Amino acid sequence: AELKMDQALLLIHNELLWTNLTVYWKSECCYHCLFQVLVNVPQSPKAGKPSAAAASVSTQHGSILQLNDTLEEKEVCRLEYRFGEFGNYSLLVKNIEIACDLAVNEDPVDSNLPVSIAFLIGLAVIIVISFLRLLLPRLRSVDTFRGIALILMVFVNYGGGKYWYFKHASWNGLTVADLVFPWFVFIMGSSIFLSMTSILQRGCSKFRLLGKIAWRSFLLICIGIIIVNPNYCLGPLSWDKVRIPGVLQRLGVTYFVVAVLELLFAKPVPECLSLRDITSSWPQWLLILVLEGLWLGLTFLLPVPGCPTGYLGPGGIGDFGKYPNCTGGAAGYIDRLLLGDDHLYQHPSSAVLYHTEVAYDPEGILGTINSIVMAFLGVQAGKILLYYKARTKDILIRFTAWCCILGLISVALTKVSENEGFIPVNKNLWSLSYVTTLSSFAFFILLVLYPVVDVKGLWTGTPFFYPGMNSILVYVGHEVFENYFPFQWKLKDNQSHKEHLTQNIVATALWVLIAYILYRKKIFWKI
Amino acid sequence: AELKMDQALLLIHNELLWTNLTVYWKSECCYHCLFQVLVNVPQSPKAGKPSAAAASVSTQHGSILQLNDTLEEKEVCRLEYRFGEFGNYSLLVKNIEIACDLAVNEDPVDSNLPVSIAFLIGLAVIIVISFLRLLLPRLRSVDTFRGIALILMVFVNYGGGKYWYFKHASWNGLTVADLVFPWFVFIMGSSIFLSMTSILQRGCSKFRLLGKIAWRSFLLICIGIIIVNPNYCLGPLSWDKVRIPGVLQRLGVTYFVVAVLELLFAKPVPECLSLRDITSSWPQWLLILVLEGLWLGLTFLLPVPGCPTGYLGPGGIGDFGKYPNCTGGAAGYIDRLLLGDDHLYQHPSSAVLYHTEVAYDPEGILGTINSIVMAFLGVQAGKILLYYKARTKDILIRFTAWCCILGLISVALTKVSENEGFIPVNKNLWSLSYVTTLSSFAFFILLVLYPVVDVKGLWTGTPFFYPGMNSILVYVGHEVFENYFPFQWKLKDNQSHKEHLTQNIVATALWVLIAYILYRKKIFWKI
Numbered sequence A, B: 001a002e003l004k005m006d007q008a009l010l011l012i013h014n015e016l017l018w019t020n021l022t023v024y025w026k027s028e029c030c031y032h033c034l035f036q037v038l039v040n041v042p043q044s045p046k047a048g049k050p051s052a053a054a055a056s057v058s059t060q061h062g063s064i065l066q067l068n069d070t071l072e073e074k075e076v077c078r079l080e081y082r083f084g085e086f087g088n089y090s091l092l093v094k095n096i097e098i099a100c101d102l103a104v105n106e107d108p109v110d111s112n113l114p115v116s117i118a119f120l121i122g123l124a125v126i127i128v129i130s131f132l133r134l135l136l137p138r139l140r141s142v143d144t145f146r147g148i149a150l151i152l153m154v155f156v157n158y159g160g161g162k163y164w165y166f167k168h169a170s171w172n173g174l175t176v177a178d179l180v181f182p183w184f185v186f187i188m189g190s191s192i193f194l195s196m197t198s199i200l201q202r203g204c205s206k207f208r209l210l211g212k213i214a215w216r217s218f219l220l221i222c223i224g225i226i227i228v229n230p231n232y233c234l235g236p237l238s239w240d241k242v243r244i245p246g247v248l249q250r251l252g253v254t255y256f257v258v259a260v261l262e263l264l265f266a267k268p269v270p271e272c273l274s275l276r277d278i279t280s281s282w283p284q285w286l287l288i289l290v291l292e293g294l295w296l297g298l299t300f301l302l303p304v305p306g307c308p309t310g311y312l313g314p315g316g317i318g319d320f321g322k323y324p325n326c327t328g329g330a331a332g333y334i335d336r337l338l339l340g341d342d343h344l345y346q347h348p349s350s351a352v353l354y355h356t357e358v359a360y361d362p363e364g365i366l367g368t369i370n371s372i373v374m375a376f377l378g379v380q381a382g383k384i385l386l387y388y389k390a391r392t393k394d395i396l397i398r399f400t401a402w403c404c405i406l407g408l409i410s411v412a413l414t415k416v417s418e419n420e421g422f423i424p425v426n427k428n429l430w431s432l433s434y435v436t437t438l439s440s441f442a443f444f445i446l447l448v449l450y451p452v453v454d455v456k457g458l459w460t461g462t463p464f465f466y467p468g469m470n471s472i473l474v475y476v477g478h479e480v481f482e483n484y485f486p487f488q489w490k491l492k493d494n495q496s497h498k499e500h501l502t503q504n505i506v507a508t509a510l511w512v513l514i515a516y517i518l519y520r521k522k523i524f525w526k527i
């Protein structure tokens, strides 16, 4: 057939004699999208010979169909159904009143079977290895956490099996792909504090440390702009098409601000209910709350011309299509004002579900405030680890307290909903509730991973700390060699989830093995 | 206008009343090519109103034009002229007998002015640096030689300014681009001997050395097949389109054969007219002469179906177009027999001047014999360096003797001509005279570079030994980052020699600087 991946076939048979029909399609994942025309089925020329037309409907989310008489502009029937991948469905519209019935000709396939099988195979290997082994400075929990986030992004960037839950969410909500970048910012803040405390304890000067901070930030930004962003398979680089924002640029700016703050207000770690780690660093908290107030003010009060003030929405056909060019609101407006459309991201994640035409950069200028807030929460985690290193009970109690506080803030902001909160979770805007949700997840992960890996030693972090010790090499590496064999080959079927998933799992395992080889040879690159 | 790079405009005005004309074009660089149709000019409809037509003629080499009456198939006049780049020439054909005259409307540009200016600027910098400095184990000559060849290939591979003398020759003869690969094979043989002598003198076992040899050869071949050959900007790799031969594959096979021979017949270096370095290694010479006899026999006596036996020619329209699919002869036939057309090089250098349609691989199977012969001559150079290291006069005398012998052999084979010798110089076939010519050049280079750099110390090899100590990193590096900024940007004019030359010079200097940075940080990768 001609069905692409994640698409079903819908055959519409119109038995009505004197009324044409227009088939409108809306996805269930849209929040207030507009109905779009799917197919036009004419009237039946003679009784007993119904006119037909075929359309392809997406199967990732539920579908809502509305059949409207193209003359009277009225609705004859409306269906809400969830079509399955590669299915063959027939819809019959006939008199006696008009009622339209949906039937299944060919059953669909189970498209999530590769994911279920890949999890069971992975779980079966873990049990065998653990059972087989039974018969036979540098914190390791932070390396394990960073390596977990690394393995996840390599799977996600390489495609994720072309599954919708291993991709970035269109506008609002969370998928597996939306977790890894905030966790990298969190871990990078924690490592900022650990490194700076060690260096300033060895007696090193603050000005040489400042020089190292500036050099590392400049180097990260330059690598991001020149190596990671461009698609050089298209052609040589021209300035008018250069994308200035990006991932490594975000890390460089966040690292500079947070590292310079910590260096400026650095204090020796002194040697048990006490708020020492919090109150000893109150100037940072004051400045961070000032930045958070700035983000809220610019997001909810800045007037954007030709756009509602405080608009938190995708534009396109979203919000009933009233604001087709307002993708982002104040964040997008500031990006376009300072950098320009041609220096932004040309394929925002909302372009597929909301059909937005403007350029929006997820790593823009306004979200760097919340990137800095995430990194500073990571710094607080490092402070807990170092201040109370003698007592494990103190560390676990503080991690639990922070996780609970940030979780309650996220519940209040998002209202435990995807689109109906006061500040819904959104990776494109780097929302406040995005930061608090992912920070509570990071504190819970550290809560589980600290006693298991560091205190007791029940686990060593294998195989996660091998890329966790070469994160920058693995990141820049898979960006450079994304199209190379063995990370990518020509598939017998591009429309198969099984083949894409196998390819991406193999490539991710190859990067874990490359990082293990570098670790085994004691080759560690720090930017 | 619409002239591309290295093209002139030819306007033909036909004043003849009753005879059409057909304009045939042949290049002077062709050996026995066929005339190709350039443009068809009809007859003049009325006296005093001559019909005209415009054609673009290449300006890299001389042009031969033949005007033939399209009815009687006779020749009215024939011109041999050398058109200049971007010139505007008008050719008038008129009665009184018929004589055709060539006139220059717009003068051409001097297309080699950027090359002349780039040499003077380079020479002016050398004089300033040498004058300014005046006011203010590992052989260095081998590193300088390898670095010179490295700088040359990086300039050549990146385009060479799009100059025809910085590209590979079409079939026969030499350009600057055809010198660098044989010199790498020569230096690699010399380094084989130096390394093996040192290791076997330190008492290391021969079997562990054999393991190291096999590992290095396998690794070189794998890197060549997977990283260097494919164009991943086109798409993911499929087996049916994989090119098996290549540069690093050639180096791997040559290294394995030569290193295993030297290891097998290794002898300690003993401590002055004597042939000790030659006669102490007579088994290698016997085996090398046997391989050379094999190459000559398979090249001049193997019967290729549908092809003359011992054909040393490009096919295409060459040799008067009698053998359009015989590109290569026995070498190409063996390549196609063993590997197949779809696993060979799809754009041989002859495809532009001789219009060949078949696939030919310059790094094929039959030329590896001559690659091994070149590497073994390099081994002989290393033997001279180590046997007579005490006496500089002995080293210089032996280098001069070898250069003279190989030069005389090259003169005898090529007959001091491009196409008229018994075995003309040809990089595609890796001819015997190609090997002897480039070996005499390498021996002369070593003759000049040994007393200057090593014995006296007048020069240190700057800036050439910095990439000479990281050759593999520089090679694989510029292959991976060929399309990246700052090595390539979008030009304001793609048809300008000045802009291409500036871009390629800047990229080559950047690779010298990268290698200097690695040397300054003591980071050396040996494959």
Ligand SMILES: CC(=O)SCCNC(=O)CCNC(=O)[C@H](O)C(C)(C)COP(=O)(O)OP(=O)(O)OC[C@H]1O[C@@H](n2cnc3c(N)ncnc32)[C@H](O)[C@@H]1OP(=O)(O)O
Binding pocket: A137, A138, A139, A140, A141, A142, A143, A146, A153, A156, A157, A177, A180, A181, A184, A185, A187, A188, A191, A192, A194, A195, A199, A247, A248, A251, A469, A471, A472, A475, A526, A527
């Ligand atoms: C959304 C998607 O799918 S793609 C988006 C995802 N983006 C990315 O993954 C970007 C890639 N980013 C990264 O890999 C990292 O965040 C980096 C490169 C910015 C660095 O993060 P960091 O945690 O700071 O890494 P790094 O190892 O360089 O840490 C630097 C310092 O921390 C120290 N450190 C790191 N881990 C630890 C640890 N566990 N304990 C103690 N010190 C540590 C290092 O010793 C070093 O200190 P030093 O230089 O004084 O000796």
Ligand SMILES: CC(=O)SCCNC(=O)CCNC(=O)[C@H](O)C(C)(C)COP(=O)(O)OP(=O)(O)OC[C@H]1O[C@@H](n2cnc3c(N)ncnc32)[C@H](O)[C@@H]1OP(=O)(O)O
Binding pocket: B137, B138, B139, B140, B141, B142, B143, B146, B153, B156, B157, B177, B180, B181, B184, B185, B187, B188, B191, B192, B194, B195, B199, B247, B248, B251, B469, B471, B472, B475, B526, B527
């Ligand atoms: C046609 C075009 O335009 S493109 C075609 C051009 N192709 C290429 O350039 C291919 C690239 N090839 C190369 O760079 C090289 O030929 C290579 C990578 C194959 C290696 O060549 P080599 O000269 O053998 O390089 P390398 O430095 O690795 O030498 C290996 C050994 O020689 C030793 N060695 C190298 N130079 C010297 C020296 N001057 N003195 C003593 N020992 C030396 C090294 O110590 C090493 O020994 P070890 O491993 O026991 O310690």
Ligand SMILES: *[C@@H]1O[C@H](CO)[C@@H](O[C@@H]2O[C@H](CO)[C@@H](O)[C@H](O)[C@H]2NC(C)=O)[C@H](O)[C@H]1NC(C)=O
Binding pocket: A024, A035, A066, A068, A073, A074, A075
């Ligand atoms: C299909 O027809 C229905 C009519 O039942 C349309 O629904 C109305 O649309 C108008 C706008 O033209 C609104 O003012 C009404 O409030 C809607 N509801 C009713 C009950 O009339 C619907 O818009 C049509 N579909 C499309 C895509 O235009």
Ligand SMILES: *[C@@H]1O[C@H](CO)[C@@H](O[C@@H]2O[C@H](CO)[C@@H](O)[C@H](O)[C@H]2NC(C)=O)[C@H](O)[C@H]1NC(C)=O
Binding pocket: A001, A009, A088, A089, A090, A105, A106
């Ligand atoms: C979906 O199913 C219908 C049957 O329910 C298929 O329609 C048949 O198509 C074949 C060839 O196209 C005809 O020979 C049959 O007569 C059709 N049957 C009916 C009942 O119409 C349709 O082809 C299927 N679509 C697919 C498989 O893509």
Ligand SMILES: *[C@@H]1O[C@H](CO)[C@@H](O[C@@H]2O[C@H](CO)[C@@H](O)[C@H](O)[C@H]2NC(C)=O)[C@H](O)[C@H]1NC(C)=O
Binding pocket: B024, B035, B066, B068, B073, B074, B075
């Ligand atoms: C142009 O015309 C000339 C005639 O002077 C052709 O030259 C002859 O070509 C025939 C082949 O058809 C040969 O047998 C003759 O030996 C050639 N020379 C002479 C003096 O007759 C020439 O081939 C024509 N050009 C092209 C491209 O066909």
Ligand SMILES: *[C@@H]1O[C@H](CO)[C@@H](O[C@@H]2O[C@H](CO)[C@@H](O)[C@H](O)[C@H]2NC(C)=O)[C@H](O)[C@H]1NC(C)=O
Binding pocket: B001, B009, B088, B089, B090, B105, B106
């Ligand atoms: C080459 O030179 C001729 C003149 O020798 C140019 O022909 C002139 O073209 C312009 C515009 O096309 C006319 O206005 C003139 O009348 C033409 N002059 C003659 C004598 O024919 C021709 O355009 C030039 N070709 C280029 C510059 O590409």
Ligand SMILES: CC(C)CCC[C@@H](C)[C@H]1CC[C@H]2[C@@H]3CC=C4C[C@@H](O)CC[C@]4(C)[C@H]3CC[C@]12C
Binding pocket: A289, A290, A293, A294, A296, A297, A298, A301, A302, A303
């Ligand atoms: C001090 C901390 C808590 C907050 C810092 C940010 C404050 C001072 C700034 C940031 C952006 C500012 C807003 C920007 C633009 C407008 C629109 C204008 O028509 C009225 C003022 C108003 C609404 C500003 C109010 C003050 C504001 C919210």
Ligand SMILES: CC(C)CCC[C@@H](C)[C@H]1CC[C@H]2[C@@H]3CC=C4C[C@@H](O)CC[C@]4(C)[C@H]3CC[C@]12C
Binding pocket: B289, B290, B293, B294, B296, B297, B298, B301, B302, B303
């Ligand atoms: C011993 C050294 C000097 C030479 C080794 C190669 C010799 C033995 C081999 C290599 C290829 C061989 C040739 C391959 C094919 C043919 C065509 C056939 O119709 C007659 C024999 C003839 C002409 C062979 C003669 C011998 C030959 C030249």
Ligand SMILES: CCCCCCCCCCCCCCCC
Binding pocket: A151, A152, A155, A462, A463, A505, A508, A509, A512, A513, A516
């Ligand atoms: C998110 C899915 C990724 C699937 C691959 C996970 C990593 C598998 C590890 C394989 C390599 C192990 C090398 C280290 C062994 C000690």
Ligand SMILES: CCCCCCCCCCCCCCCC
Binding pocket: B151, B152, B155, B462, B463, B505, B508, B509, B512, B513, B516
């Ligand atoms: C074949 C033309 C290439 C032009 C560039 C030649 C190399 C220039 C050297 C510049 C970098 C010097 C770095 C080392 C300085 C000590």
Ligand SMILES: *[C@@H]1O[C@H](CO)[C@@H](O)[C@H](O)[C@H]1NC(C)=O
Binding pocket: A018, A019, A020, A042, A043, A071
């Ligand atoms: C249905 O559409 C056709 C166009 O092909 C039109 O001619 C016809 O009038 C329409 N039906 C009605 C009832 O108007």
Ligand SMILES: *[C@@H]1O[C@H](CO)[C@@H](O)[C@H](O)[C@H]1NC(C)=O
Binding pocket: B018, B019, B020, B042, B043, B071
């Ligand atoms: C020249 O070519 C034309 C085709 O356009 C043809 O009609 C004419 O006959 C030819 N000239 C002669 C002399 O045959």
Ligand SMILES: CCCCCCCCCCCCCC
Binding pocket: A173, A174, A403, A407, A410, A411, A414, A416, A417, A418, A425, A437, A440, A441, A444
């Ligand atoms: C898609 C909607 C996301 C809302 C998430 C709300 C929960 C925030 C964290 C809850 C506690 C986490 C403990 C691990």
Ligand SMILES: CCCCCCCCCCCCCC
Binding pocket: A211, A212, A214, A215, A217, A218, A252, A253, A256, A257
């Ligand atoms: C000692 C070396 C100093 C290098 C300085 C390079 C420029 C630093 C700029 C960093 C700015 C990043 C945040 C905007």
Ligand SMILES: CCCCCCCCCCCCCC
Binding pocket: A207, A208, A210, A211, A214
């Ligand atoms: C005495 C040693 C000092 C070394 C340099 C430290 C100062 C670096 C300044 C960089 C500031 C960056 C601002 C963009």
Ligand SMILES: CCCCCCCCCCCCCC
Binding pocket: A205, A206, A207, A210, A260, A263, A264
């Ligand atoms: C050992 C000397 C300490 C003196 C204070 C050092 C403060 C360094 C932070 C400066 C922040 C400014 C960034 C541009």
